[PDB]
Scaffold this active site. Sequence first.
Site, mmCIF file in Angstrom:
data_model
loop_
_atom_site.group_PDB
_atom_site.id
_atom_site.type_symbol
_atom_site.label_atom_id
_atom_site.label_comp_id
_atom_site.label_asym_id
_atom_site.label_seq_id
_atom_site.Cartn_x
_atom_site.Cartn_y
_atom_site.Cartn_z
ATOM 1 N N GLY C 21 0.799 -1.219 0.000
ATOM 2 C CA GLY C 21 0.000 0.000 0.000
ATOM 3 C C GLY C 21 0.833 1.270 0.000
ATOM 4 O O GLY C 21 0.510 2.233 -0.707
ATOM 5 N N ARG C 44 1.573 10.629 -8.985
ATOM 6 C CA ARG C 44 0.816 10.671 -7.728
ATOM 7 C C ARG C 44 1.650 10.224 -6.539
ATOM 8 O O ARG C 44 1.107 9.842 -5.500
ATOM 9 C CB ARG C 44 -0.476 9.844 -7.821
ATOM 10 C CG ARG C 44 -1.484 10.473 -8.760
ATOM 11 C CD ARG C 44 -2.603 9.544 -9.140
ATOM 12 N NE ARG C 44 -3.503 10.212 -10.073
ATOM 13 C CZ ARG C 44 -4.577 10.899 -9.714
ATOM 14 N NH1 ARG C 44 -4.952 10.987 -8.450
ATOM 15 N NH2 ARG C 44 -5.299 11.508 -10.651
ATOM 16 N N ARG C 88 0.556 -9.147 -3.702
ATOM 17 C CA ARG C 88 0.411 -8.116 -2.690
ATOM 18 C C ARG C 88 1.149 -8.550 -1.433
ATOM 19 O O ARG C 88 1.044 -9.708 -1.015
ATOM 20 C CB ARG C 88 -1.074 -7.849 -2.401
ATOM 21 C CG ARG C 88 -1.294 -6.794 -1.324
ATOM 22 C CD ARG C 88 -2.769 -6.447 -1.104
ATOM 23 N NE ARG C 88 -3.082 -6.343 0.314
ATOM 24 C CZ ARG C 88 -2.497 -5.499 1.152
ATOM 25 N NH1 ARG C 88 -1.587 -4.634 0.735
ATOM 26 N NH2 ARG C 88 -2.818 -5.534 2.443
ATOM 27 N N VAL C 89 1.933 -7.630 -0.873
ATOM 28 C CA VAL C 89 2.701 -7.832 0.348
ATOM 29 C C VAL C 89 2.259 -6.754 1.325
ATOM 30 O O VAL C 89 2.381 -5.557 1.042
ATOM 31 C CB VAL C 89 4.217 -7.786 0.096
ATOM 32 C CG1 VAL C 89 4.630 -8.904 -0.855
ATOM 33 C CG2 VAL C 89 4.651 -6.445 -0.445
ATOM 34 N N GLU C 182 -7.527 -4.682 0.462
ATOM 35 C CA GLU C 182 -7.288 -4.646 -0.976
ATOM 36 C C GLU C 182 -7.392 -5.978 -1.710
ATOM 37 O O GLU C 182 -7.749 -5.958 -2.893
ATOM 38 C CB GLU C 182 -5.889 -4.064 -1.253
ATOM 39 C CG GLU C 182 -5.755 -2.584 -0.967
ATOM 40 C CD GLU C 182 -5.262 -2.285 0.441
ATOM 41 O OE1 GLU C 182 -4.788 -3.203 1.144
ATOM 42 O OE2 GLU C 182 -5.339 -1.115 0.854
ATOM 43 N N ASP C 205 -1.860 -6.826 14.453
ATOM 44 C CA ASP C 205 -2.812 -6.655 15.540
ATOM 45 C C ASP C 205 -3.765 -7.838 15.607
ATOM 46 O O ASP C 205 -4.202 -8.351 14.572
ATOM 47 C CB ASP C 205 -3.647 -5.378 15.355
ATOM 48 C CG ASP C 205 -2.820 -4.122 15.410
ATOM 49 O OD1 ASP C 205 -2.570 -3.644 16.529
ATOM 50 O OD2 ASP C 205 -2.426 -3.613 14.337
#
Lengths: 236, 236, 236, 236, 236, 236
Positions: C21, C44, C88-89, C182, C205
Site C-alpha cells: 500500500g 501521484r 500483494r505484500v 485490498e 494486531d
Amino acid sequence: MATPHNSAKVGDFAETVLMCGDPLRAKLIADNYLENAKQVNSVRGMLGFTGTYKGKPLSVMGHGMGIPSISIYAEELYNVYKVKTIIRVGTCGTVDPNVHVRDVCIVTASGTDSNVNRMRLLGHDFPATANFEVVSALVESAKALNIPTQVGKAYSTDIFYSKEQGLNEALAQYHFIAVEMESAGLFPIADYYGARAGCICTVSDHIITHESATPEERQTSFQNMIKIALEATLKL
Amino acid sequence: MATPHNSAKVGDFAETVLMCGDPLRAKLIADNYLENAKQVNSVRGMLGFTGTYKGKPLSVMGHGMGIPSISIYAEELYNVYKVKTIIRVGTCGTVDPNVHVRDVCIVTASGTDSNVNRMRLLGHDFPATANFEVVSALVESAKALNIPTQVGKAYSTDIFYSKEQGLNEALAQYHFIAVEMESAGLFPIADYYGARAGCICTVSDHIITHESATPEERQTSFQNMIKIALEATLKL
Amino acid sequence: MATPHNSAKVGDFAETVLMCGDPLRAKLIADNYLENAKQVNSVRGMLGFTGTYKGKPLSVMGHGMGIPSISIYAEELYNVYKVKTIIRVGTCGTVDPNVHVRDVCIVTASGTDSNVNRMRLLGHDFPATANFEVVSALVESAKALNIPTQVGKAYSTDIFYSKEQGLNEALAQYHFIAVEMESAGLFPIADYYGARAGCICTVSDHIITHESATPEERQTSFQNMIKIALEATLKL
Amino acid sequence: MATPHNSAKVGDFAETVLMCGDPLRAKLIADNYLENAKQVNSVRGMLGFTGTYKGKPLSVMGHGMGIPSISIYAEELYNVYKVKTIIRVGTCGTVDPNVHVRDVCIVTASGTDSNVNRMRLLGHDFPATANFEVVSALVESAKALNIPTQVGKAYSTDIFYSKEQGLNEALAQYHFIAVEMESAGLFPIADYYGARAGCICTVSDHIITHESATPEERQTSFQNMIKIALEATLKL
Amino acid sequence: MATPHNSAKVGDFAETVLMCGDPLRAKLIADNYLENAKQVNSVRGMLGFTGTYKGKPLSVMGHGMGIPSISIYAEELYNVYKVKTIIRVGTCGTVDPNVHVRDVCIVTASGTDSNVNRMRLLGHDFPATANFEVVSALVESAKALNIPTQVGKAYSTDIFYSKEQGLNEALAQYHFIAVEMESAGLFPIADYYGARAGCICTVSDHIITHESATPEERQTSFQNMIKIALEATLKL
Amino acid sequence: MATPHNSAKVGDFAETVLMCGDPLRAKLIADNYLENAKQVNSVRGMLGFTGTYKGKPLSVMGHGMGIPSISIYAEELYNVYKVKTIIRVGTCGTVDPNVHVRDVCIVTASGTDSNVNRMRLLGHDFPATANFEVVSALVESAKALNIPTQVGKAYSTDIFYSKEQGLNEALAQYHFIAVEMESAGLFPIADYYGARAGCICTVSDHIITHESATPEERQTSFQNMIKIALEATLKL
C-alpha cells in the site's frame, strides 16, 4: 438415531469422508474401492459406507442434490460424527474456453447464487474456500498418477434448469472452471467446525461449445477422479 | 433416459403426483394406499410409483431435501412428464402460538430465504402461491373426514440447522403456520408450466414452546394428512 | 503517458510485480532487496521500481489504500504493462483464535464488504480467489526458509475505521485469518486478464484480544514476509 | 381525533370494511349499495361511511394510492377501530394471456417491488397472502351470482408510470392475473393484527395486448365486482 | 504519530482543508496559491501543507484514489485534527447533455455504487449530501469572480475502468453533472462529526460525446476552480 | 381527461406549484393566500387550485400520502402540465439533537427506505436531491422574514407506523433533520423532466425526546412556513 437423517452411530464414520450426490454412486465407490466396507446409513436412501483404503479408515456417502441437502449431511458429519475432512467428488459442466470435456477440475473456491453464505457473514461476500492442504493433496495425487488437472474456481447454482441470460458468459470471462450445485455450501460448514473440505469434479459437458462426454468417456473420467481422491486421502 | 434424474418414460407418471422428501416414505404411500402400483423411477434412489386411488390414476415420488432438489424433480415432472398437479405432503415445524403439534397445515403461500424466486421476477417479491383449486380440495377433503385444519402461510428455508436470531419471532408475529424446506420452490415452477401445486404438512414440532410429537402421534398425523391428500386428488 | 496514473513505458515493469500500500515501503523494498534498481513511476507519488532479485527481473510498486486504488493500478499493470503475476505484500489484523501477532498469512481467497465483485457476476457471490501456483510458491518458499505460515481466508474492507457490530465475531467463527483492505479487488482483475495474483500479509494486531506487535516484532515479521515473497518470485 | 388520519370514533366502523382507492368511489358505493349510511370520516378528503347491506353493518372507505397510503389507513382500522376484515375493491391491469378486459380477479397473494415486506421478515421473502376464508367467500359469492372469476396472483407496484423493461413479460410467464398498487401492503398488516384481508379487482387494461375497457365495460365489471364483495360480506 | 497515516501534530492543520486526489497537485496548490506554506505530512507520500490564502490559514492535502482512501484521511482530519470543513477539489467526467468540458461543477449531493453508506443507515438510501453553507460559499464566490458554474449531483464510483452497460445513459437521464470517485464517501463522515464538507470539480471529459479538454484547457479550468475554492474559504 | 388522475386542462396549472399531502390544506392555502383562485382539479378529492401570489401565477394542490402517491401527481404535473417548479410544504418529525419542535426545515436531499430510486439507477445509490435554486430561494426568503431555519437532510419512509429498531438513532447520528414520507420520490422525477423541486417542513414532533407541538404551535409554524414558501416563489 444420532441425527434426523442418519442412522449411523457415533464412530461409524471415519475422519475422512468422500461424498457424491448419487447414493448409488457412493455404493459403487464402496464396492469397488473400499476394503471391508460396511453400510452405516440408509435413511432416506442416502447410502453411506465405511471401510479402509490402503489400510486407512475411509467413508463414502451420498449428499443429494443442492446446497440445502449437502448442508444437512455435512453439518451432521462434522458436528455429530466428528469428521475432520470431506472431499466432494462429482461431475460438472464448464464454461471456460481452455477447459474441455473429460478434464479433472480441482476446486479452490466456489461462487454461488444461493443466499446461505451472505446469511453467515452479515450480508457480505464470504468466499466458499477449499482447505489448502486438501487442494494440494489432490493436485499432488494427480501428478503422481500422471493425470493432468485444472485448478480453480467453481460456481454452485441452486437451479439445474437455468433460464438466466448472460451468466455463462460472465463465468467464462472470469475463468470459472466448474459449474455444479453443492461445493459453495460445503466449505463454510467445514470452516464453522474448524475442519477441512475440498472438491474434485470431472467435466461432462461444455456449456458454451455444447461438447459432451460419451458414457464411456464419463466412466474413464470417473475412474481417474476417484483414484486421485482416494490417493489424496492417504496424505490427509 | 427421459431426464438426467428419472428413468421413467413419458406417460409413466399420472397427471396427479404426491411428493414427499423421503423416497422410502413415497414407497410406503404407494404400498399402503395405491392399487396396482408399479415402480417407475429408481435413479439416485429417488423412488417413484404409479397406480390408482379409488380408480383414478395417481403417482407418488420422493423429491429430496431442499428447494434445489424439488426444483429438479418438479421441473421435469411438469415439462417432460406432462404432470398437471403436484401436492407436496410432509411434516413441518410451527412457530404460531395458536398452532400445535399434530395439527394439519394446508399451505396457501410460502416465504423463503432462498434467492430462486427473486431471480425469476427481476429481483422483486414473487409470492410462492398454491393453486386455489388444490387448496380448496384439501380443505374440503379434511372437512369430509372431520379432521381440523390450519390454513395459511409456510416458510421454506435453505438451512435445516438454523443459527438465525429473531427469525422465529418474526414468523410467529405474522402467523406463519409451517416451517419446512421445499414448498416455496415448487409453486413458481407450477406457474411457469401453467400447472397446479399445493402443499399439506403435519406439525411434528413447536419451534417456540419445544413441544414435540411422539412417534405414535406422528404416525396418526401422517395417516390423517395422507387421507386428506388422497381424497383431494379425486376432486382434482 | 501509457496510462493516466503511470509514467512507465511498456516493458519498464517486469512480468512479476510485488505491490504494497505505502509507496515508501515499495522504495524500501527496492533499496534493500533489489539490485540494478531503477525508479519507473512517480505519478501521484506512487513509486514503482524495477530491478533484479537473485538475477531475475522483478518490480515493486505501491498500490495505495483500498479496493478502488489497487484496482486502478492492477488493471493497468495487467492490461497495458503486460504483467503476468502480482503479489500483494502487506500487513493485516486477525480475528482468528489460533492466529497471533507476528504470524505470516498466505491468502487463498478473500471476502469483502465491497460491491465490485457482485457487479462482475450479475449480483451473485464471486469469490476473490488467489492463483494456486502463486499460493503454492509462497507456501513452499516459506517452508524452505524455515518460516511457519498460516494459510486461509482474508477479508477486505472498504472502511478502516469500522463501526460495525458483530462482524469480527462472525469472521472469527469462520476462521478468517487476515483483515485488510485490498486483496478482494486484486484477484478478480487477474482473472479477467487470464493472469495470476496472490497476497501475503503479516499480523500486526489481534482484533479480538487487542495484542499488538512491537516495532521490533513488525521488523521481524516484515523481513520474514518479504523474503518469502522474493524467493517465491524465482519459482514463478 | 382517534388517529391522525381519521375523525371517526372507536366503534364507528363495522367489523368489515370495503376499501377502494378513490374516496369518491367509496361514496358511490355507500350511496348506491348501503342503507342507513352515515359518513364517519372526512379527514384529508378520504371519505368513509358506515351503513348496512341486507341488514348487516358494513363500512366503506377510500385508501388513496399506493402501499404507504393503504398501510396508514389499514393499520389504524385494525388497531384503533378493531376491524376484523378488510376487502380491497379495485381495478387492475393484467398481463396473463388467458385473462381479458372485463374479467373479475380474486387475489390469493401479491408480489411487489416495495421494500415494506422484506423489512418485516429480516430481509427475506414474505408472501403478502389473502385470508383463505375471504378468498373462498368471494369465490362462492361469485358462483352464487353466476359471475365467472379468475383466481390467482396480483403484483403491487410503487410506480404507476413504469419505465421497467422486461417486467410485464416475466409477470405474464408466471401467470400473474392482476397488476395494481396496494394489495401487497394490506395482507401483512392483517397478519400482524391476527385479522383478515382480501382483494377483488376488475381488469381495465391488458398490458400486453393494449386492449382497454370501454366506459360501458367498466360499468358492467364494477357492478359484478361490487355485488360479489357485498354478498361475500354477509358470509364473513 | 497522531494517526496511523499522518505525522502532523494536532494544530498543524487549519480548520479548513482543501483536498485533491494527487498529492503532487496538493503541492502545486500550496506552492502556487498559498503563502507561507509548510509541509505538515509526508506519510505514504500523501503530502499535506498549511499556509494562508489572503492572510487566513488554510491547509491542502492529497486524499488518494477512491472512497476507502478519502475515508481514512477525512475521518482522521475531523476526529484527531479537529478540522471543521473539507472541500474536495478535483476533476470529473460528465454525462449531462447540458454540461460541457471545461465546466466547473459544484456538487450538492453524490450517488455511488459503494456499499459504505448503506452500511451506515441500516441498509437504506443515505444521500451523501454537501453542507449548504459550503455549497453556497462556492456558488457565491464563483459569482463574485464572474465564473459560471453548474450546480447539482455527482456520482462516485469504485471502478475507474468501468465495464457497466447502461449506467452512463441512466446518469444522463437524471442529469448527474459529475462522475468521480470520492465525494460520496466524504459527506457522510462530515455528518458523523457534525462538520462540513463540499466538492467542486472541473469537467475534463464528456463521457457520452467523448469530447476531451486539452492540457491547456485543463490548466485554465483548474485556475478557475481553485480560485473559487480559495475565495470560498474566506467565507467559511 | 388530460391524465387518469387530474381533470385540469393543459395550461390550468402555473409553472410553479406548491404541494402538500392534505387536499383540504391545499384548499386552505388557496383560500387564504392566493388571489383570484380557481379550483382546477377535484378527481379523487385531490383538490388543486390556480391563482396568483403578489401578481405572479401560482398553483397549489394536494399530493396524498406516500412516495407512490406524490410520484403519480408530480409525474403528471411535469409531463402533461409542463410545470417547472414544485415545492412540497408539510410537517415532519425530527431526530436531530439540535432541532426542536416548531423549527422550519429546508431539505437539501432525502434518504429513503423505498426502492423507487434504486430502480432508476441500476440498483445503485441515487440521492434524491433538491434543486439548489429552490433551496436558496427558501433560505433567503426566511432570512428576509427573520424566521430561523435548519437546512439539511430529510428521510422519507414508506411506513408511518414504524416498528424498526435502531433507525432513529442512526438518523440522529448523521444529523438528519426531517422525517416525512414523500420528498425522496419527488426530487428524482423533477430530475427526469429537467425541472426543479424542493421541500420545506415544520417540526411537529421530536421522535427521540417525544416533545410535541400544541395545535396552536402547529398553526403558527404553518403560517411561518407557508409565507417562506410563497415569498420564495417570487424569486423562482
